[PDB]
From Swiss-Prot:
The gene is NOTCH1. This is Notch 1 extracellular truncation. The chain holds residues 1734 to 1757 of 2555 of the full protein. The chain crosses the membrane at residues 6-26. Coiled coil: none annotated.
Length: 30
């Protein structure tokens, strides 16, 4: 239970967003 929600912050499903955000700032600027 305690490790269930901790697995999310353990670095995985969120790190994915890290790669999704890098392209966001690139789409704005030219």
């Amino acid at each position: 239970k305690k490790k269930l929600h901790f697995m999310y912050v353990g670095g995985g499903g969120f790190v994915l967003l890290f790669f999704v955000g890098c392209g966001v700032l690139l789409s704005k600027k030219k």
